[PDB]
């Protein structure tokens, strides 16, 4: 029986999702004796293959109910393992972790999409001995001193498969946890192996974009008044073709990412800025063929965006690529809040200084007063007792009021930013850079919109046991003195 | 070694009578006085402060400089291209210098009356100012987050190593 | 016998340096009973003067394997001292 009404569905209100079935309730409430009874009573045994209204099996239900705390996750890991070990008795021919819900997700793929690092790490690295060895995803090949060599099973994991765990973490997962998931084994060595095969394609793509931005600059400089002339025309055609090429390449990106489009740009803001630079490059050449002089401010905007977009490629090296992650932060969220306070001050004082500076015994218009009042924040204030104005003492008191209120506001704003951002949290920039390299790899593996690359398959087909049990395994070698010495 | 090479080179260029001896003599005069800060290690108070002050800032400013120079050059080629049409910014050097003056507080931010695209030139300056001051705010907060950690001050011992060397 | 192939050398990849000798392995794996047996069995006593391919003795091997953590360093200090104290029995003229 499925408890399927809105109280039992997963949503932001008052609810309790446990799956929908008696067996999934008994698992999520941590009742082995009830789970054992429901599974192996003679009257009506609970099928481990049974699914709720979302298609979730009890293993998807346990992944939905995992929280990344040590008390929940350790007990969900035990509940998951004993149900999987009971599946090997009760359903011996059935691969319970190959059962897909209505989103096409297995329990491992669902743990990646929902960002559940603790149960994800456990499933991904799972190892057993004796009867349950085929339920492993990790097989130790040999161990010697501080060194372990392990084969990891890549079945749902390698990006050779469509809708794989790597594609999910990069493009379908919403969570803060994505950068912690790409730095787990085997994913860390597997993404390094892919990156090493593609780093020459990454820097070729950068060198083409440097040559395009050199030509863009040499043609935006050397514009005529509004052999050198035919080379200028060639430069405009190369910019049109580079602008159409980038416009088609980014429309293909957003077409492929359509179902999860916000997830595919929330951190990856350059995928919008390359589309915008390409649109403005095509629009500026179109306005130039129309001969309208508004082509030049579009060409110059797409030249600025063109060089700002060159900062995308700083992720290719650890030192620049981690710093591009250290620098950009929570400041973008709070400056957009401070800007509302700063613009009510700036406009409120601008309409006032304009109204009062109108009478004779700067400040000529709302734009000019907004600009003179804005110059106080760049240190160019021009603060003076204006001799010709009738109300010159009140105009000076309005400037002294604006200065004091604005510098109190900037002092409040800097101290508010320090209070949230200088917290001592250990720096998570290396792992956010590893996720930027993962997103870059998983895009490069498709080739280009015009030349769609045939994907190479990672690891080797190896016999790990008797199901024989032959799997695409990937060999990781770990050296760990600090963990090993504690076992001596 | 550099101050000594430039001192020998500047006297060699002076014996050659080439007027480029003077900018080498003046560079080796600057380095000459900067090198006088070596001897601050002879006393505990100046010698520990020479160790408090120099730090991880030299590593991260060389990373920020790549971001700042892509902004500065990207906006300089743009303001030069757009300020070319009549109804500052005469060359890549002059626009790089006018845009650099915004970081020393000497910005000269204005609605230029004679330029055809003067509103777009002002919007390009307001875009550069806002992006650069967001970048400097990100850079200062990034530096505080690594360098204000509460680690107990290891300057007395780094000064003892300077005295050992 | 010297375990001297690249897995046993010290480098930035996958490796396990212990010196290269049975006695240096027994010391770095913290096995006094094996260290005592290798040093003072009657069949073939391990020379405390014996060296790997870098010329490292067991005392250089223990210095290579020290980490500045309190658990590693305290146990390396005990392993180093007992080998040095055994050198005063087994190699009494040798510094
Ligand atoms: C259609 C058939 C003809 C194909 C011609 C060759 C295409 C090469 C494509 C390539 O190198 O693109 C690099 C860059 C986009 O970078 P990105 O997709 O990695 O990252 C995008 C951001 N996510 O895009 C560019 O630099 C623009 C390409 C045009 C300029 C080529 C200059 C060549 C100089 C040697
Ligand atoms: C490829 C050689 C591997 N070796 C260690 C490297 C020197 S090994 O000593 O042969 C060995 C060690 C341990 C195990 C095991 O734990 O199953 C098996 C083999």
Judge residue A439's burial from the number of C-beta atoms within 10 Å of its C-beta, 0-12 exposed, 13-18 middle, 19 or more buried.
buried
Smallest Cα–Cα separation from B13: which of B30, B2, B1, B26?
B26
Angle at B120 between CA A214 and CA A239, to 5 degrees: 25
Helix (H, G, I), strand (E, B) or coil at A268: coil
Q: Which residues in chain C are contacts of A481 at CB distance < 8 A?
A: 67, 72
3-state secondary structure of C51: coil
Nearest by CB to residue C16, choosing from A147, A486, A488, is: A147
Cα–Cα distance for residue pair A184/A170, rounded to 1 Å? 14
Q: Phi and psi dihedrals of A116, rounded to 5? A: -85, 80
Contact between chain C and chain B (3 or more Cβ pairs less than 8 Å apart): no
How far apart, in whole angstroms, are the C-alpha atoms of residue A484 and residue A146?
Answer: 5
Q: Collapsing DSSP states into helix, strand and coil, what is residue A331? A: helix
- Token pair, residue A105, equals 């997700």
Cα of A438 from ligand 1 centre, angstroms: 20
A245 alpha carbon – ligand 1 mean position (Å) = 7
Mutate to test the pocket of ligand 2, among A141, A142, A464, A484 (most ligand atoms within 8 A of CB): A142
* Number of neighbours of residue A206 by Cβ within 10 angstroms: 15
Q: How far apart are CA A84 and CA A97, in angstroms?
A: 8
CA of A195 to the centre of ligand 2 (A): 30
The residue nearest atom 17 of ligand 1, judged by CA position, is A205
CB A123 within 8 A of CB A107: yes
Our CA dihedral for A229, A234, A235, A238, rounded to 10 degrees, sits at: 170
Residues with C-beta less than 6 Å from any ligand 2 atom: A 142-144; C 7
How far does chain C reach from its first CA to its final CA, in angstroms? 23
Query: Which residue has its alpha carbon closest to ligand 2 atom 5?
Result: A144
Q: Which of C14, C15, C23, C4 is nearest to C87 (CA)?
A: C23
Radius of gyration of chain B measured on its C-alpha atoms? 23
Cα distances (angstroms) measured from residue C48 to each of A461, C34, C65: 47, 14, 17
Name all chains with 3 or more CB-CB pairs below 8 Å to chain A: B, C
Contact by Cβ (8 Å): A258, A252: no
**Chain C neighbors (3+ CB pairs < 8 Å):** A
Beta bridge pairs of residue A472: A461
Instruction: Give chain A's contact residues with C (Cβ, < 8 Å).
Output: 144-147, 477, 479, 481-482, 485-486, 488
Calpha distance B151→A165 (Å, rounded): 40
Which residue on chain A is closest to B92 by alpha carbon? A221
Whole-angstrom distance, CA of residue A8 vs CA of residue A23: 14
Q: In what order do the strands lie in the sheet with A460-465?
A: A138-144, A147-153, A469-479, A460-465
Q: What's the CA gap between C22 and B105, in Å, rounded?
A: 69
Tokens of A380: 């160019």
Residue A437, min C-alpha distance to chain C (Å):
22
Residues 6+ apart with CB under 8 A from A349: A369, A373, A398, A401, A402
Q: Where are the alpha helices (DSSP H) in chain C?
A: 22-28, 32-40, 58-65, 70-90
- Residues with Cβ within 8 Å of A56's Cβ and at least 6 positions away in sequence, in order, are A19, A24, A64, A101, A110
Phi then psi for residue B19, to 5 deg, are -70, -15
Which residues are CB-contacts of A247 (< 8 A; sequence separation ≥ 6)?
A275, A278, A279, A281, A282
Which tokens sit at A8? Answer: 């039992």
Q: In degrees to the nearest 10, what's the CA dihedral of A102, A104, A106, A112?
A: -110
Encoded tokens for A426: 């250990």
Closest CA to C19 of C83, C71, C63, C73: C63
Question: Chain A to chain C, count of Cβ pairs less than 8 Å apart?
Answer: 24
> CB–CB of A485 and C16 under 8 A?
no
> Resolution reached, in Å?
2.7
* Mutation site, B64, B65, B78, B106, interface A, largest A CB count within 10 A: B78
Query: How long is chain C?
Result: 95
The answer for C46, left when phi > 0, alpha when psi is -120 to 50, beta otherwise, is: beta
**Spatial distance between the Cα atoms of B99 and B90, rounded to a whole number of angstroms:** 12
Phi, psi of A267 (to 5 degrees): -95, -30
Experimental method of this PDB entry:
cryo-EM
| Closest A-chain CA to C18 | A145
- Main-chain phi, psi angles of A472, to 5 degrees: -70, 95
By C-alpha distance, which of B131, B71, B116 is closest to B95? B71
Strand A469-479, strand A460-465: pairing: antiparallel
Alpha helices in A21-106 (DSSP H): 22-28, 32-40, 58-65, 70-90
């Amino acid at each position: 029986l499925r408890a399927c009404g809105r109280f039992f569905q997963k949503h932001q209100g008052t609810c309790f999702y446990f799956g929908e079935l008696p067996l999934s309730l008994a698992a999520c409430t941590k009742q082995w004796d009830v789970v054992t009874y429901l599974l192996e009573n003679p009257h009506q045994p609970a099928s481990l293959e049974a699914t709720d209204s979302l298609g979730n099996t009890v293993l998807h239900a346990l992944v939905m109910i995992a929280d990344n705390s040590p008390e929940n996750s350790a007990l969900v890991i035990h509940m998951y393992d004993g149900l999987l070990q009971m599946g090997a008795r009760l359903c011996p021919t059935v691969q319970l972790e190959e059962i897909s819900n209505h989103q096409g997700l297995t329990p491992l793929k669902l743990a990646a999409k929902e960002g559940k690092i603790e149960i994800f790490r456990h499933i991904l690295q799972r190892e057993f001995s004796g009867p349950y060895q085929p339920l492993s995803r990790k097989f130790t090949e040999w161990c010697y001193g501080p060194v372990r060599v392990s084969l990891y099973d890549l079945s749902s994991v390698d990006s050779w498969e469509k809708n794989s765990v790597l594609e999910i973490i990069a493009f379908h997962c919403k969570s803060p946890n994505r950068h912690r998931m790409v730095v787990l084994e085997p994913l860390n060595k597997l993404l390094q192996e892919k990156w090493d095969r593609l780093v020459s394609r990454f820097f070729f793509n950068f060198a083409c974009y440097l040559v395009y931005m050199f030509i863009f600059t040499v043609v935006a400089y050397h514009q005529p008044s509004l052999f050198g002339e035919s080379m200028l025309l060639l430069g405009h055609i190369l910019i049109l073709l580079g602008g159409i090429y980038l416009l088609l390449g980014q429309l293909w990106y957003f077409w492929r990412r359509r179902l999860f489009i916000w997830i595919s740009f929330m951190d990856s803001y350059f995928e919008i800025l390359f589309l915008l630079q390409a649109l403005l490059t095509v629009l500026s050449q179109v306005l130039r063929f129309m001969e309208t002089e508004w082509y030049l401010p579009l060409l110059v905007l797409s030249l600025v965006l063109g060089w700002l977009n060159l900062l995308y490629y700083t992720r290719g090296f650890q030192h620049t690529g981690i710093y591009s992650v250290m620098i950009q932060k929570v400041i973008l969220r709070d400056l957009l809040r401070f800007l509302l306070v700063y613009l009510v001050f700036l406009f409120g004082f601008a309409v006032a200084l304009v109204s009062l500076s109108r009478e004779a015994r700067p400040y000529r218009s709302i734009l000019d007063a907004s600009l003179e009042l804005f110059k106080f924040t760049i240190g160019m204030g021009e603060l003076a007792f204006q001799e010709q104005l009738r109300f010159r003492g009140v105009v000076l008191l309005l400037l002294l009021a604006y200065v004091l209120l604005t510098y109190v506001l900037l002092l409040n704003m800097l101290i508010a930013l320090m209070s949230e951002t200088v917290n001592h949290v250990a720096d998570n920039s290396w792992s956010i850079w590893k996720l930027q390299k993962a997103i870059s790899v998983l895009e490069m593996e498709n080739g280009y919109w015009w030349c769609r690359r045939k994907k190479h398959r990672e690891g080797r087909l190896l016999k790990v046991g008797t199901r024989p049990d032959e799997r695409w395994c990937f060999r990781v070698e770990e050296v760990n003195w600090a963990a090993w010495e504690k076992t001596l």
